[PDB]
């Protein structure tokens, strides 16, 4: 059986976002993200401030699935959460929304202590496609983590433009290691 | 809490964020049962599920090494 978007099911899960249990609050945020009904936006925003990190993570995730821009400013605040997975979730959600107000908080997240947050910030910057990210991404080509380094290289390919082209033309001669290979490959594929 | 089999099941959910959340949950449990399902999740179509599975396997492996060294010391 396949189902229609059910308003009674969404109202149930909205109420469940204020449930005493954290497992119920978490499951509600995931079900609301899966339904993708915009009624869930303001209650999901309130859940980004939940006491439990699992619920905040789920609310950020669902808000990115829904893709509503009302969530931009609260997701910018969640990029500063104490929990690493909340920050990773908020970066992905901001990339999905694609609103340019997230560019500067995402450039800061490229310097996160967690490798998984840095990948998600690079990926979100590649999605937004804003040139302001170029020099911060070129710097992330020296990340200690290889997956962070590839994510920054993939995001540079996504942005393109004259700033990326001039930066890659230079880096193919001035760079070392992975960064130099990135620039050489960029020049052969463009 | 014996909810490990529920998250192992969630590693097959159609919602990429549910499968990612399952891999993270399993990394935070630290149970060896999650090892074979998480190694499979390293081939997931979604980048973030793969990242969560590599992270979870690291957390489980560290806990395994720590508990074994703890017994010795």
Residue numbers in the entry:
A (entry chain B): 7 to 196
B (entry chain A): 13 to 85
Show the paper's wording:
We have recently reported the design of a new artificial repeat protein family named αRep. This design was based on a specific subgroup of helicoidal repeats commonly found in thermophilic microorganisms. Artificial proteins based on this design were shown to be well-expressed, folded as expected, and extremely stable.
Target A3 is an αRep protein randomly picked from Lib1.0, previously reported as αRep-N4–a. The crystal structure of the A3/bA3–2 complex was solved to 1.9 Å resolution with one copy of the heterodimeric complex in the asymmetric unit. The A3 structure in complex with bA3–2 is very similar to the previously solved structure of the uncomplexed form (rmsd of 0.6 Å over 186 Cα atoms). The bA3–2 protein belongs to the same structural family as A3 but contains only one module between its N- and C-caps. Surprisingly, the first helix of the C-cap of bA3–2 (residues 73 to 85) flips by 180° relative to its location in the C-cap of A3 and forms an extension of the second helix from the preceding repeat. The second α-helix (residues 86 to 108) from the bA3–2 C-cap has no defined electron density and mass spectrometry analysis revealed that the region encompassing residues 94 to 108 was proteolytically removed in this protein sample, presumably during crystallization. Despite this difference, bA3–2 is structurally very similar to A3 both in its apo-form (rmsd of 0.3 Å over 60 Cα atoms) or bound to bA3–2 (rmsd of 0.5 Å over 60 Cα atoms). bA3–2 and A3 interact via their concave faces which encompass the surface residues that are allowed to evolve. The complex has an interface area of 860 Å2 (corresponding to a total surface area excluded from the solvent upon complex formation of 1720 Å2), which is typical of protein-protein complexes. As for bA3–2, half of the residues involved in A3 binding (11 out of 22) are from randomized positions and two-third (15 out of 22) are located within the N-cap, which plays a predominant role in A3 binding.
